[PDB]
Amino acid sequence: AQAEEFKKYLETNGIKPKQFHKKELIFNQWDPQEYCIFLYDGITKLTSISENGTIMNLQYYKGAFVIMSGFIDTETSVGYYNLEVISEQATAYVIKINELKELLSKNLTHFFYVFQTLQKQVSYSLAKFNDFSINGKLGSICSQLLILTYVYGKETPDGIKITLDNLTMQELGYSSGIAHSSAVSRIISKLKQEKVIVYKNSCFYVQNLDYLKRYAPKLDEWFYLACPATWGKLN
């Protein structure tokens, strides 16, 4: 993997792996230092918290990927957010945004690795913006379940199980723009009656992937074009 070789390149340049447990914040929106984090193992989400305390979930990040809170060119903030750990365990190499440019200059197979993750991210946020915007809040819930089925799902004799040890009703609402937790509950019950989803084991299971797929066409296309292994597993 490129991830494996980047991991090694990091350890060889004195950058060591740091472990985290559930609910720990790799960075926070008040930290005045900026970073590049190479998330290597684990599951994570990016949040923003309002002036009043309202919480928006911007995105899940899994597996090996990179997340940046600063600009290389200027070293200043891209904007203020948190990266929270969701899984029982995660590991990440934290680099100061001031050290990045020199690291990537030196070994440009790694420069292209990070640019690749930037292209994926660029393209992903666009697809997601298209699908969340059309069909309003119905399509938002269908779009987020589709993302979670492709990334975290698993084949199972009773459907496709979403392997998120938590995933609460309120948590889904934070990812859509939904303030009331009962509004989410309507959407979830409405999808249950039509045999789209089921809920057992403290876990969500999907059963008409085709239905979701119809509310989230730009994203399905994106899994196909950007992550064809992940996509082919359930297609």
Added chain:
Amino acid sequence: SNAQAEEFKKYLETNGIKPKQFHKKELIFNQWDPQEYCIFLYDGITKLTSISENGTIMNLQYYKGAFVIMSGFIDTETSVGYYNLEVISEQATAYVIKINELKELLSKNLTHFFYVFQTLQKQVSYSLAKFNDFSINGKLGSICSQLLILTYVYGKETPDGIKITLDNLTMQELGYSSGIAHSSAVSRIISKLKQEKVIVYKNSCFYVQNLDYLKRYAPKLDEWFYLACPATWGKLN
């Protein structure tokens, strides 16, 4: 800087890639016959669109001035997705780099590799800010957010308020930016902003009277403009 953009332009010309002229309503690329490029848009105004099977038009984003727009992945040479890039100004000039030539060019001069990397970091951050603000307060917040955006980039101080100087900009086009397909849904929001004295529609142009009001609904974007485009932000203070 933006001396960086001029420098990239010069580097491309030296290396045999020539400028190209496009005209209002032309497509540089389209979603039905996808081609893979780096578009270096040098001068003029464009919009990235998608049209769904039922005829629903989504305006994803406006692109101006100097900027970079990718339609393929360099590592794999395939599509990032199916979109249209449509010219809004009367003229626009762009450098159309084939995706299979880009790596070579960026590999021989890291200065320009980093200018492209920076532009893409600005895109990522812009999309997150816009997603935050469009999501939190329904369609009211989406329309206020797109107005603040167009006010910073295309606005001009006049005696009647900040005039959005953008060729068309109709009710319907404004609705396309936030997944609104019926004009009646937009006018309902614009009616409220008019009653509340935030905007005036006059001489076929929107004039903004209370930018501070739009900031309440678009707090992540105003922060993004502050951090990412301080000259543009400073102009309107």
